[PDB]
Design a protein around this ligand. Structure first.
Ligand SMILES: NC(=O)c1ccc[n+]([C@@H]2O[C@H](COP(=O)([O-])OP(=O)(O)OC[C@H]3O[C@@H](n4cnc5c(N)ncnc54)[C@H](OP(=O)(O)O)[C@@H]3O)[C@@H](O)[C@H]2O)c1
Ligand SMILES: Nc1nc(=O)c2nc(CNc3ccc(C(=O)N[C@@H](CCC(=O)O)C(=O)O)cc3)cnc2[nH]1
Length: 159
């Protein structure tokens, strides 16, 4: 099974030139819980923004160019990225926009964080049709002393 995981503001914004103007440790805890011990596939821009390998996960980076860090696995196409995952129950695709676009048609589950924030961005999660997906889990949280905005975790499974 292939799954996508993302945090989206309104209008599906997931990225901007500068750092996002939110602080959501609860969302990062959620991303951790849902990705540990599974292979994660990311594109090279997302790799550069994370800055290190994510512990406890097989990290697979898509790039057209030769790799620059032997601690992770570098692949040059989508088919190679899936092959590099091996025989696992669930592959986690962690972005960014160009990567989500290519993997959406293959995905059976979406793990989405919807954030109550309006921001101008340059990168969006792909458009998806709510009726093509079943909402199996949803939980809303208010902002608090640690988290700057309200947010809702949702898991969707493809109909
Ligand atoms: N809010 C969230 O959930 C979230 C999640 C992830 C990322 N983000 C944000 O999203 C932004 C980056 O997204 P993005 O679309 O610019 O970048 P991206 O998808 O992370 O990376 C794109 C890069 O991946 C490589 N690539 C992609 N598909 C490929 C293919 N089929 N074959 C070979 N290489 C391929 C290319 O690397 P080369 O250029 O080296 O060829 C490409 O330039 C940042 O703002 C980041 O912080 C947000
Ligand atoms: N829901 C969700 N939220 C995100 O912020 C997110 N970010 C990415 C890409 N960027 C990042 C950036 C940093 C870390 C990170 O440092 N995570 C650590 C720390 C978690 C914690 O502080 O609890 C990790 O071990 O996963 C992960 C992904 C992809 N999917 C996402 N999905």
């Amino acid at each position: 099974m292939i799954s996508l995981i993302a945090a989206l503001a309104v209008d599906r914004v997931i990225g901007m030139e500068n750092a996002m103007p939110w602080n959501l440790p609860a969302d990062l805890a959620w991303f951790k819980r849902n990705t540990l011990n599974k292979p994660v596939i990311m594109g090279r821009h997302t790799w550069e923004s994370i800055g290190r390998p994510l512990p406890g996960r097989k990290n697979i980076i898509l790039s057209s160019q030769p790799g620059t860090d032997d601690r992770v696995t570098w692949v040059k196409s989508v088919d190679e990225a899936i092959a590099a995952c091996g025989d696992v129950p669930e592959i986690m695709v962690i972005g960014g926009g160009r990567v989500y676009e290519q993997f959406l048609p293959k995905a059976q589950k979406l793990y989405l964080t919807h954030i109550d924030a309006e921001v101008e961005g340059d990168t969006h999660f792909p458009d998806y049709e709510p009726d093509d997906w079943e909402s199996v889990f949803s939980e809303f949280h208010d902002a608090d002393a640690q988290n700057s905005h309200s947010y809702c975790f949702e898991i969707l499974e493809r109909r």
